[PDB]
Design an enzyme around this catalytic site. Structure first.
Site, PDB file in Angstrom:
ATOM      1  N   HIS A  58      -3.104  11.092   0.194  1.00  0.00           N
ATOM      2  CA  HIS A  58      -2.547  10.948   1.558  1.00  0.00           C
ATOM      3  C   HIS A  58      -1.913  12.272   1.992  1.00  0.00           C
ATOM      4  O   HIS A  58      -0.775  12.283   2.433  1.00  0.00           O
ATOM      5  CB  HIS A  58      -1.577   9.773   1.590  1.00  0.00           C
ATOM      6  CG  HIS A  58      -1.460   9.079   2.900  1.00  0.00           C
ATOM      7  ND1 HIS A  58      -1.541   7.720   2.991  1.00  0.00           N
ATOM      8  CD2 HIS A  58      -1.210   9.541   4.145  1.00  0.00           C
ATOM      9  CE1 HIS A  58      -1.365   7.365   4.245  1.00  0.00           C
ATOM     10  NE2 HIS A  58      -1.191   8.464   4.984  1.00  0.00           N
ATOM     11  N   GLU A  86      -8.032   8.771   5.627  1.00  0.00           N
ATOM     12  CA  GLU A  86      -8.382   9.329   6.971  1.00  0.00           C
ATOM     13  C   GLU A  86      -8.988  10.739   6.882  1.00  0.00           C
ATOM     14  O   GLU A  86      -8.355  11.724   7.260  1.00  0.00           O
ATOM     15  CB  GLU A  86      -7.131   9.301   7.842  1.00  0.00           C
ATOM     16  CG  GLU A  86      -6.457   7.932   7.853  1.00  0.00           C
ATOM     17  CD  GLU A  86      -5.402   7.755   8.927  1.00  0.00           C
ATOM     18  OE1 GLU A  86      -5.463   8.467   9.956  1.00  0.00           O
ATOM     19  OE2 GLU A  86      -4.489   6.940   8.698  1.00  0.00           O
ATOM     20  N   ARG A 113       0.882  -1.193   0.000  1.00  0.00           N
ATOM     21  CA  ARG A 113       0.000   0.000   0.000  1.00  0.00           C
ATOM     22  C   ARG A 113       0.907   1.226   0.000  1.00  0.00           C
ATOM     23  O   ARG A 113       1.795   1.317   0.897  1.00  0.00           O
ATOM     24  CB  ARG A 113      -0.903   0.006   1.237  1.00  0.00           C
ATOM     25  CG  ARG A 113      -1.572   1.345   1.516  1.00  0.00           C
ATOM     26  CD  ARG A 113      -2.923   1.212   2.199  1.00  0.00           C
ATOM     27  NE  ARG A 113      -3.551   2.526   2.222  1.00  0.00           N
ATOM     28  CZ  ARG A 113      -3.502   3.414   3.210  1.00  0.00           C
ATOM     29  NH1 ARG A 113      -2.881   3.164   4.364  1.00  0.00           N
ATOM     30  NH2 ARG A 113      -4.100   4.574   3.023  1.00  0.00           N
ATOM     31  N   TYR A 128      -5.064   1.984  15.623  1.00  0.00           N
ATOM     32  CA  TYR A 128      -3.805   2.085  16.404  1.00  0.00           C
ATOM     33  C   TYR A 128      -4.037   1.884  17.891  1.00  0.00           C
ATOM     34  O   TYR A 128      -3.119   1.328  18.520  1.00  0.00           O
ATOM     35  CB  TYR A 128      -3.142   3.438  16.175  1.00  0.00           C
ATOM     36  CG  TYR A 128      -2.575   3.573  14.803  1.00  0.00           C
ATOM     37  CD1 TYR A 128      -1.344   3.019  14.501  1.00  0.00           C
ATOM     38  CD2 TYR A 128      -3.288   4.198  13.798  1.00  0.00           C
ATOM     39  CE1 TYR A 128      -0.783   3.143  13.240  1.00  0.00           C
ATOM     40  CE2 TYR A 128      -2.749   4.323  12.527  1.00  0.00           C
ATOM     41  CZ  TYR A 128      -1.489   3.791  12.238  1.00  0.00           C
ATOM     42  OH  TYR A 128      -0.946   3.887  10.975  1.00  0.00           O
ATOM     43  N   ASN A 149      -7.800   2.093   9.449  1.00  0.00           N
ATOM     44  CA  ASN A 149      -6.500   2.424  10.083  1.00  0.00           C
ATOM     45  C   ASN A 149      -6.748   2.486  11.592  1.00  0.00           C
ATOM     46  O   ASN A 149      -7.431   3.431  12.053  1.00  0.00           O
ATOM     47  CB  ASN A 149      -5.898   3.707   9.502  1.00  0.00           C
ATOM     48  CG  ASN A 149      -5.601   3.592   8.027  1.00  0.00           C
ATOM     49  OD1 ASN A 149      -5.699   2.499   7.450  1.00  0.00           O
ATOM     50  ND2 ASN A 149      -5.178   4.701   7.433  1.00  0.00           N
ATOM     51  N   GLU A 181      -3.791   0.028   7.719  1.00  0.00           N
ATOM     52  CA  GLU A 181      -2.722   0.479   8.637  1.00  0.00           C
ATOM     53  C   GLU A 181      -2.919  -0.089  10.034  1.00  0.00           C
ATOM     54  O   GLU A 181      -4.000   0.091  10.604  1.00  0.00           O
ATOM     55  CB  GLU A 181      -2.690   2.008   8.757  1.00  0.00           C
ATOM     56  CG  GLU A 181      -2.382   2.720   7.459  1.00  0.00           C
ATOM     57  CD  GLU A 181      -2.209   4.209   7.604  1.00  0.00           C
ATOM     58  OE1 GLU A 181      -2.262   4.698   8.762  1.00  0.00           O
ATOM     59  OE2 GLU A 181      -2.049   4.871   6.565  1.00  0.00           O
TER      60      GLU A 181
END
Ligand SMILES: OC[C@H]1O[C@H](O[C@H]2[C@H](O)[C@@H](O)[C@@H](O)O[C@@H]2CO)[C@H](O)[C@@H](O)[C@@H]1O
Ligand SMILES: OC[C@H]1O[C@H](O)[C@H](O)[C@@H](O)[C@@H]1O
Length: 445
Positions: A120, A165, A76, A294, A292, A351
């Site tokens: 991005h 995002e 990616r 985290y 994504n 991600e």
């Protein structure tokens, strides 16, 4: 308990164009909003810029040989709008298209499936000067960029992602002033948030038209698990509001043609520039939702964020060097929520990863046991998600290598591959050597 992932599971690593490529003036590239934002004092914690980064521009071939060593079947990356259309619109920069053609060519001949992110966070400065994300004209500017690059590459790129995002783009860019272009205004955030969704919706049929029946496209949402600090009724309200702000603000428009009503009301419903048929465009069917993930964020009633009237609590647990709580269960929770509530036909983790303080040993190795344990726990959560019937089709580690970590600069290292910035030497980390056996086994020992 758990071993093997589905036979066609896409194991990946992920990067973005401004974080790795460098060569910021090479081959007609114009400055991005990040080239300009890095000039601002206090913007980057270590005073660095993405001017050189990992020099992946002049060095992609070697970086692909490293992905072959990692045994990924997928990579990616993002395409730099500043290289494709340096004037923002009009004249195609042929040398810019060329780089992404060489990249995709070298990936396919090493049997690595390319997953291309269109945006991005690196809009050309000159285009931002005409159409900031809060200006509705940005939509057609992005569609035009999408059109040019999808026409060149969709013979070879099946998997496309519109924007990375929306929350970061709109809130960190325009609401908190922490990301390019560094503005801090509730109205500007809410408008930018809406134009990101519209830009996603208007691009979808352009990607499909410029492709074949194999073409797959979707958006990438950042989503974290949100937690009420207590069961106190105003701590649960604070958590509900941050959830609406962080996780539901884009997901509800995309699948149900609505913003979360109570937070829309709290903000001032008029600040969002909704026009007729906007929700029809935003709900355009996608082939997947990219996530994504985290961390867990634990919220209490307060006034740190004065806009949301919330404070953040750190519960006892493990924290990365970003000060992010490690919470693998969170990934299973996010994927299950999306499955039960939106039923996307396919989910990707585009991600997931962790920043820990890395050192090169006297032997020349990078021993990152905490990163390795982070990845193991999250791959375990993904495996459980698949066993529960959640249609997770791939997992891309953030990141292939240490890179420009936006407002943290180079001090924060997310790589499973270390970069000595003094020499551009890549050292595969212990976490990377472990990942290399995960990809080949197609699961966990
Ligand atoms: O650098 C610290 C940064 O962290 C948070 O931003 C994260 C966000 O949580 C993630 O979901 C991710 O996709 O992107 C962000 C960029 O690191 C904080 O909210 C932010 O204020 C802070 O700068
Ligand atoms: O801030 C940590 C991460 O946040 C986002 O998910 C970005 O896509 C990535 O470039 C960055 O490393």
């Amino acid at each position: 308990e758990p071993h093997r992932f589905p036979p066609d599971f896409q194991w990946g690593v992920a990067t973005s164009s401004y974080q790795i490529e460098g060569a910021v003036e090479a081959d007609g590239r114009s400055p991005s909003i990040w080239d300009t934002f890095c000039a601002r004092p206090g913007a980057i914690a270590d005073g660095s810029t993405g001017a050189i980064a990992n020099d992946h521009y002049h060095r992609y071939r070697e970086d692909i040989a490293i992905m072959k060593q990692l045994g990924v079947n997928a990579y990616r990356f993002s395409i730099a709008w500043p290289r494709i259309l340096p004037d923002g619109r009009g004249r195609v920069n042929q040398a810019g298209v060329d780089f992404y053609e060489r990249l995709v060519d070298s990936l396919l001949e090493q049997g690595i499936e390319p997953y291309a992110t269109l945006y991005h966070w690196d809009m050309p400065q000159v285009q931002h000067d005409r159409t900031p994300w809060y200006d509705r004209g940005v939509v057609d500017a992005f569609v035009e960029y999408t059109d040019v690059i999808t026409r060149r590459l969709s013979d070879r790129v099946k998997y496309w992602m519109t924007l990375n995002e929306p929350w970061v783009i709109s809130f960190l860019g325009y609401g908190a002033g922490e990301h390019a272009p560094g503005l801090r205004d509730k109205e500007l955030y809410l408008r930018a948030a809406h134009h990101v969704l519209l830009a996603h919706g208007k691009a979808m049929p352009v990607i499909r038209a410029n492709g074949n029946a194999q073409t797959k496209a979707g958006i990438v949402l950042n989503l974290n698990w949100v937690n009420a600090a207590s069961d106190s009724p105003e701590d649960q309200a604070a958590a509900r509001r941050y959830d609406q702000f962080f996780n539901r603000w884009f997901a509800e428009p995309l699948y149900n043609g609505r913003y979360p009503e109570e937070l829309l009301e709290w903000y001032g419903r008029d600040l969002v520039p909704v026009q007729p048929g906007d929700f029809d465009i935003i709900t355009t069917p996608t082939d997947f939702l990219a996530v994504n993930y985290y961390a867990r964020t634990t919220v209490k009633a307060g006034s740190t964020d004065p806009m949301l009237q919330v404070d953040f609590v750190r519960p006892p647990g493990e924290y990365t060097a970003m000060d992010w709580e490690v919470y693998p269960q969170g990934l299973y929770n996010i994927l299950n929520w999306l499955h039960t509530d939106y039923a996307p036909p396919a989910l990707y983790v585009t991600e997931n990863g962790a920043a820990y303080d890395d050192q090169v040993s006297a032997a020349g190795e990078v021993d990152d046991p905490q990163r390795l344990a982070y990845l193991e726990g999250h791959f375990e959560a993904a495996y459980r998600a698949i066993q529960a019937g959640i249609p997770l089709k791939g997992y891309f580690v953030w990141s292939l290598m240490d890179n420009f970590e936006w407002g943290r600069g180079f001090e924060k290292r997310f790589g499973i591959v270390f970069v000595d910035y003094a020499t551009q030497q890549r050292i595969i980390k212990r976490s990377g050597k472990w990942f290399s056996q995960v990809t080949r086994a197609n699961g966990l020992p």
